[PDB]
């Protein structure tokens, strides 16, 4: 179980205040859930011209819900919203490993959005 990591693709809808080129920003991130520890990490793909000096990430640790309870694998669901640290992500897709693991565990993963 040392190398078992669930993948959860998500996007963040973030309004932009005073940009001439855009009014809304979509931050595509990946959530890694380590089955060894229950820890979760957030990573952001570095685009060639995203304009960010370096992407916003979240090092793996026990990420708690806003109430205080830690976030387990049950909270992370495709097509649903995950909120932590004031940040909300809408999960839309997973990798084949997580897909097959959920299939055999019995939870029917929604089709990718």
């Amino acid at each position: 179980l040392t190398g078992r990591v669930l993948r959860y693709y998500g996007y963040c809808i973030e309004p932009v205040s005073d940009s001439a080129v855009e009014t809304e920003r979509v931050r595509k991130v990946t959530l890694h859930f380590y089955l060894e520890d229950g820890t979760m990490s957030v990573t952001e793909a570095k685009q060639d011209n995203s304009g960010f000096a370096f992407p916003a990430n979240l090092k793996r640790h026990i990420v708690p819900n806003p109430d205080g309870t830690p976030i387990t694998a049950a909270h992370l669901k495709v097509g649903q919203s995950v909120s932590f640290y004031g940040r909300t992500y809408e999960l839309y897709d997973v990798d084949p490993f997580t897909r097959a693991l959920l299939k055999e565990a019995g939870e029917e993963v929604p089709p990718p959005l």
Partner: peptide
């Protein structure tokens, strides 16, 4: 410097201050 803002409250700091 990457690790310190990899935390949840490391997003507060202005990027140019790094």
């Amino acid at each position: 410097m990457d690790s310190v803002r990899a935390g949840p409250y490391g997003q507060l700091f202005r990027p140019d201050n790094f």
